[PDB]
A paper describes a structure:
As the expression level for HsUT-A was too low for crystallography, we opted for its structure determination by cryo-EM instead. For the 17 residues where the map was ambiguous or favoring C-terminal half, we left them without building side chains to make clear that the model may not properly represent the map for these regions. HsUT-A3 shows significantly more negative surface charge on its extracellular side compared to other urea transporters. Whereas the extracellular surfaces of HsUT-B and BtUT-B are only mildly negatively charged and DvUT close to net neutral, nearly the entire extracellular surface of HsUT-A shows electrostatic charges of less than −5 kT/e with Adaptive Poisson-Boltzmann Solver (APBS) electrostatics. Superimposing the HsUT-A3 structure suggests that UTBinh-14 will not fit into its equivalent site due to its unfavorable environment: HsUT-A3’s binding pocket is significantly more negatively charged than that of HsUT-B, in particular for the 4-ethylbenzene binding region. HsUT-A and HsUT-B appear to have similar lipid tail groups, with the lipid features in both HsUT-A and HsUT-B showing at least 16 carbon chains.
The overall structures of HsUT-A and HsUT-B are similar to each other and to BtUT-B and DvUT, showing the trimeric arrangement with 10 TM helices and two pore (P) helices per subunit. In both structures, each subunit hosts a channel-like pore for urea transport and the channels are in the open state with approximately 2 to 3 Å in diameter at constriction formed by V69, T177, L292, and F342.
Residue numbers in the entry:
A (entry chain C), B (entry chain B), C (entry chain A): 91 to 442
The structure:
């Protein structure tokens, strides 16, 4: 009905106010769901539930590791006396979600290698510390960290263990050593379009198109503008992949579009007031993220580490630090950032 | 005559005031020339013309790519609402000049590979964004970026494409793997001295001695102190190359002196009030830049990327952040920095 | 007697006040001794003497290079007009001590290769500049550099020269390329416990257990809490080495515990008011430093450079930038940091 279309969209402030006075177990589950959703800048528990459903569709071992990471990161943020409003908003759980997910994804062992849950825990514990340190650094420029605890922690882990580790071996990443055989006639446009939901789903490390579809559904039910910019960023990523002559097997996998999804979501509406100048700037940031992800992948394959989400964080920080005399390119303060619709409403209200 | 020796030297403020009220096409050409000259801290359109002549002497394809990069960077700075006084001073064109130049230099394809003009444009467009982000960062310490948009953009491009790219392959850079055979009797001092103008010309990527001579001529006609410090920095680079046992073929090429030229120019008179303490500090910064360029070259050859001008930027930022109780080592504010002669005049006026 | 137990412990303020009015040669020797001791956060000349004795026990060539580095760094800090109170406190000599030490340790040539004293001097001269630049950066967050001049300088040197240099070749560092054969039955617990003093001694690059014992003695006679946290950090390093499946030959060498010693010393009492929360945070920082040192070692072996003390500096900066609502985790201002006992006394006095 029309009544649920108000209590299920946005950040779900009504449900948050209703749950604020309940058992702390339910509040912790709500925080874990919001942290699951917050990977794509969504503070919605129902979106988090749908994202968890998608993770289960992809790989139940991966969602086990991700849930463990989120729980451990939220608990470490509680124990470290972090801001309760940030913990209740899932801002201390998405880095741990990604840590657990990508530590299960890049594990050379089989599924359900239960010994992997010790590094998952010990690395997800270090996400609140990195988040607080990087916030102490960035607070002088009103910048978010965006995934930098996760990137630092997972790069540290995948370099400490490496492929030739005895307990927790990682997958082998090697630099390119031969000009790829690219036959442009053997090109599947069905798979190219399928790489848009796969590109959205690769934000969590899931190469299944149905999980990407579920993620898109969650994005839409929280904020349609976030879903639109996610789709457009994935398209931009695919296009930039094609423009630099990339093997089609890498474009189909979505390994070229998940760093542009987050950049488009962040620039177009989330941390800039959404206008058409902001939309073009988001497209430019998605393109810059695609090319920077190419660079960082080719550069970190030498060390044997996957690119992670370094490209997204770096280029989004770059485009947030950009200063423009255009009054239509307006960067919202970090305290007034909820989602593109409310952001645009606040922008219009403070401008007029 | 003596009259032109006033309207052709310095930043050419008289010609700038005369052109301020003319057709915007002429003003844009003036901005492009000033941006060409601003690579070596020179805000002079005639110096930019002489530098363009030198680029034509080296390789007309390289000057085509460089001119395209400068034009595209100035246009992107205009579209992004950047500061008009900084665009009119060429501060938004030298990074694009270097981007285009070094993207044509490190291209595996032949000359006039017209498809290279698309990455040149798309990478020169990203130089104003990087410049504005790094200025938002550095404004808290009164620091210039010095070439950091260019370094970031070109490293990103040369890592995204790489040697094994299908469309835009780059030259192969490999780390050292054997102790070089250095015969100190087969040593040409003529070529050693020729490596000083070649070292000045390698700032733009030109290994021809006549282009380096033309660059020196431009430096002198704008500011004789800049030309002197450029020559001394190139000498210091050559000496530091000899001191660490470098193959003579690399010293002759000037690949050891172009990162010390810029450092000496920046420290001795440009961003410090020129004294003898400042001169010694500039020599020390040139030596530090030579050794840091050795390090960064040996370190980035593993990733297959040339050192660029990372050494210069890093060591110059280091020597500008240096705090000294010596009243003779005075760092000018970024608003009062034009060229060493005017800088010293301002220093004397505000000190006395 | 009980009288010397007051004039030999702590920062030796009485002896400093007595020597303040003597020949500048004696004052310079005192500064060099304090700089030798300041590697492990100790401003004590007797501790510096004992550390020099330990360096002589390890390798007289290494202590020659270290002493030369300390002298050259203190002289360069004097010539660069640095703060006299920081030079008198050895804050400008420990980076040069480590530079000289680790440049002699990682030299492919034999002992007493007297030509190595030129790079030692020229690299120790660059430690005051790096220290002043990084202090100008960190002063906005009240952070110490902790060894960052040393890390930058020594990484720069070992990358500029490299293994295949003709004058100053360095030792060959190669990345791991095969899963290590780890026989847990062939495990020596005697050597495991011996790796605690060896882990403390590897802070200076000394793998001898007697030098580590001497270092522990110096730590204790200056501040027993510093010695305790050094031992605990070395233990934590050994444990984290065991937890990630490390070859026993690397654990015995102490190459896994010297980056946790400094982190534990820095967090537990030195730069945080020593409590039990601070002690647990120091253990966590030591564990994070062990894993980050694993990562940085595996990552910098690709470039052929040893990890140095990058892990310590980075993780300690991370844990100092951490902001906590816990009133018991209190970060002292940089001006009121002498040693854990005086730090705790000051904390109690300002809290009550
Ligand atoms: C930006 C978004 C753009 C979206 C465009 C969406 C679609 C874009 C690509 C679709 C067209 C591909 C044409 C099929 C094969 C053509 C061919 O075979 O060669 C023709 C030339 C390649 O020259 P080559 O001789 O090396 O051929 C290689 C085969 N060989 C090696 C065996 C000889 O093609 C091009 O120069 C493509 C130029 C790309 C223009 C976009 C610029 C983006 C670069 C920015 C990087 C910043 C970092
Ligand atoms: C600073 C500016 C200085 C300008 C000086 C300008 C000129 C400087 C170099 C000109 C002299 C070269 C002598 C000809 C060959 C000598 C030889 O063959 O060997 C004699 C020794 C090398 O010892 P080795 O046994 O390895 O011989 C190698 C041959 N082999 C491997 C086959 C056995 O020479 C030296 O130790 C040179 C010491 C350099 C002093 C300057 C210090 C700068 C280092 C800073 C790094 C910071 C980073
Ligand atoms: C934290 C401090 C903890 C201190 C603990 C102090 C002691 C900790 C280690 C002592 C126990 C070693 C057991 C002897 C060999 C066992 C064995 O052989 O295998 C059993 C499994 C390994 O599985 P796998 O099949 O690969 O066997 C490898 C042999 N193969 C390849 C030939 C098949 O063991 C484990 O999963 C150990 C789990 C480690 C738990 C600590 C988590 C720390 C990770 C944080 C990283 C963040 C970055």
């Amino acid at each position: 009905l029309s009544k649920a279309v108000g209590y299920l969209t946005g950040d779900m402030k009504e449900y948050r106010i209703w749950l604020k006075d309940k058992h702390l177990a339910l509040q912790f589950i709500d925080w874990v769901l919001r942290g699951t959703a917050q990977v794509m800048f969504i503070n919605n528990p129902l979106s988090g539930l749908i994202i968890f459903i998608g993770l289960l569709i992809q790989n139940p071992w991966w969602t086990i590791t991700g849930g463990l990471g989120t729980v451990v990161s939220t608990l470490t943020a509680l124990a470290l006396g972090q801001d309760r409003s940030a913990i209740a908003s899932g801002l201390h759980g998405y880095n741990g979600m990604l840590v657990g997910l990508l530590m299960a994804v890049f594990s050379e062992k089989l599924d359900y290698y239960w010994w992997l849950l010790f590094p998952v825990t010990f690395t997800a514990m270090s996400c609140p510390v990195l988040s607080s340190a990087l916030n102490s650094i960035f607070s002088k420029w009103d910048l978010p960290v965006f995934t930098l605890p996760f990137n630092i922690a997972v790069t540290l882990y995948l370099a400490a263990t490496g492929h030739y580790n005895l307990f927790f071996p990682t997958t082998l990443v090697e630099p390119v050593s031969s000009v790829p055989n690219i036959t442009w006639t053997e090109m599947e446009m069905p798979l190219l379009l399928q790489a848009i939901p796969v590109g959205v789903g690769q934000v969590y490390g899931c190469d299944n198109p149905w999980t990407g579809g579920v993620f898109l559904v969650a994005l839409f039910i929280s904020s349609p503008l976030i879903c639109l910019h996610a789709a457009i960023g994935s398209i931009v990523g695919l296009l930039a992949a094609l423009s630099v002559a990339t093997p089609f097997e890498t474009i189909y996998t979505g390994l070229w579009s998940y760093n542009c999804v987050l950049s488009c979501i962040a620039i177009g509406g989330m941390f800039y007031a959404l206008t058409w100048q902001t939309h073009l700037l988001a497209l430019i940031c998605a393109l810059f993220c695609a090319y920077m992800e190419a660079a960082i992948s080719n550069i970190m394959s030498v060390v044997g580490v996957p690119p992670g989400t370094w490209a997204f964080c770096l280029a989004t920080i770059i485009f947030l630090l950009l200063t423009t005399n255009n009054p239509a390119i307006f960067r919202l303060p970090l305290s007034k950032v909820t989602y593109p619709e409310a952001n645009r409403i606040y922008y219009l209200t403070v401008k007029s």
